[PDB]
Amino acid sequence: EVQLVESGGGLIQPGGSLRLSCAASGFTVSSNYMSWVRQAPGKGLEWVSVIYSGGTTYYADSVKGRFTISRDNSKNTVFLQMNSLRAEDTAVYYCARGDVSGYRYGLDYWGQGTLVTVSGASTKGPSVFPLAPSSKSTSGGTAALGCLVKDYFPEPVTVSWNSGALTSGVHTFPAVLQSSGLYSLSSVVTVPSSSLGTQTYICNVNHKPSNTKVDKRVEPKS
Amino acid sequence: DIQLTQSPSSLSASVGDRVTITCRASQGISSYLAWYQQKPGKAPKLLIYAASTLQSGVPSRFSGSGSGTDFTLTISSLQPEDFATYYCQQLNSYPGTFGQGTKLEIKRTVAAPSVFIFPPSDEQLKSGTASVVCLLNNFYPREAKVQWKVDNALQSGNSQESVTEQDSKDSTYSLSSTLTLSKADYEKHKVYACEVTHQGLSSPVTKSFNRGEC
Amino acid sequence: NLCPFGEVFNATRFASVYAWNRKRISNCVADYSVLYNSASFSTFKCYGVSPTKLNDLCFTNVYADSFVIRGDEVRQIAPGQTGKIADYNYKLPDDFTGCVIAWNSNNLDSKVGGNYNYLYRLFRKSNLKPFERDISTEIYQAGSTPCNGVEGFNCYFPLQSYGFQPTNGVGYQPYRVVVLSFELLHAPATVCGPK
Ligand SMILES: *[C@@H]1O[C@H](CO)[C@@H](O)[C@H](O)[C@H]1NC(C)=O
């Protein structure tokens, strides 16, 4: 199938430089128009740049002179070199196949996105605490347990349960920006009360910006 | 400059309803317009290209119409999975302007939340801080109220809330409220409770704990 | 006799930009200032020559390349330009000596519903060499798998229709373009104004 995989995002101080990559498989990048579209957190979409099959490049006014798009034909990758970054450039950057001018087909295949956070603040790894399922009168047949991922910077953190085996009942909440300038997030899961002694529940937290990887075991109190 | 005015900004629709979203261009853009569907935490997905041509893999209930200035997107029989933000995009010239977005909400029957309270962990209390969490699970509508009470004193200013995006299957929401206080302050009080008020609850529900497994 | 500019400029139909038309004009008298003094053209740029000095000058051969493009693409009919037109349809050399003449043809070339008789090449592996005309309709291979003339996934139709409607924005309306290329070789000059 067609896959576009971005990398290179993360925290960068104002004025800094970053180089995003986009590895494509399923089509030839050199034989296609390849665009980069960005999305400011909680805002809409905005085209940033495009690279033609023949070499021609075009940029949006907001990035002209600071961003450079390029590609490696042997690696089937598209690069976007962002220079002189400002806080306005904090966004999720997507690469997509297609063009936005006279190209009736639009952007059909898009990458997963990569968060570029332009900030002066420094990287901070999360602290993972269990959200202890209070052993009540069993709550009939359903119990809830979770994980509190406290004080991290920048975003994001990825929370899975039992390495991905547990998906039904899992709710990972949007992070909140605390008065400290750090984010905090929680992921809970509803499981049967009967499996609180038999089965084990582990929450896997991954904060790539600080290379933190924690696997916290969540069991009831005694 | 081509201006794209997409309306409505938000719209709530029941399952099986027929939903229409409009996009209006400042100049004649012929059929150079596309519609995208964006689900939470995921990249946009192309639905219709060339104003009316449905993309491969996209269900038959999606349709595009219009040419020149006025374009519409219609979802013939709305499904729970259709919850997303829809964007139009002009493909006539750079900078390929996108519409503002239309947040589509699935109307559902009222569902009361399932309330859960979590004491702070001993690992966290060792660090010098206490975070008490109140979870409200699978509720409809989005409007809920968590009131923290510490020894019956209503807490204000020391809590933060987070609401999940609408579910793809049951179209319900979940809310997490965190009361944060120092370890020193935490040990000054015994009863910690969160009283939840929601449309689906006739009486406000209170889940509580006494610090020290009491 | 008099050079046939009327045949080129006042033609009933024009070519699509991908398959641009070329008219060789030789052995005749041409009034270039009667063209410039025709109050109708939205563009009259001359490169390496003047439209008045053009009259009292002799050339070996003069070419008239006619085609239709949208107004915002008229900027690409100039030396050292980029875009789907300059790159994949019609490219001028840097050392270009000639004139570029354009005019709004929304009255003739835009039908209610859309004029689908005017095409432009959207896909091409590389840029055109100056004065290259690529009329290939071969299905474009955007992936690794061969197409074998079948349009489909990663297999595109190279050419796209302009879809000119009368309701279109002025920049996105059809414009008729005529490019006069002046040739000067060791052979005698057969095209002049007042000789
Ligand atoms: C084209 O037609 C107009 C009007 O009939 C005429 O005035 C003009 O001289 C003609 N152009 C050429 C190049 O002969």
Short mmCIF file of C-alpha atoms and ligand atoms in Angstrom, two decimals, chain C residues 5-6 9-10, ligand 1:
data_model
loop_
_atom_site.label_atom_id
_atom_site.label_comp_id
_atom_site.label_asym_id
_atom_site.label_seq_id
_atom_site.Cartn_x
_atom_site.Cartn_y
_atom_site.Cartn_z
CA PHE C 5 -0.61 38.20 -39.56
CA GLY C 6 -4.41 38.10 -39.96
CA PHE C 9 -4.14 36.51 -35.00
CA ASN C 10 -7.65 36.41 -36.38
C1 LIG D 1 -8.04 41.34 -37.15
O1 LIG D 1 -9.39 41.82 -37.29
C2 LIG D 1 -9.58 43.21 -36.96
C3 LIG D 1 -11.06 43.50 -37.12
O2 LIG D 1 -11.61 42.92 -38.30
C4 LIG D 1 -8.68 44.07 -37.85
O3 LIG D 1 -8.85 45.46 -37.56
C5 LIG D 1 -7.22 43.66 -37.66
O4 LIG D 1 -6.40 44.44 -38.52
C6 LIG D 1 -7.02 42.17 -37.95
N1 LIG D 1 -5.70 41.74 -37.52
C7 LIG D 1 -4.76 41.32 -38.37
C8 LIG D 1 -3.46 40.90 -37.75
O5 LIG D 1 -4.94 41.28 -39.58
#
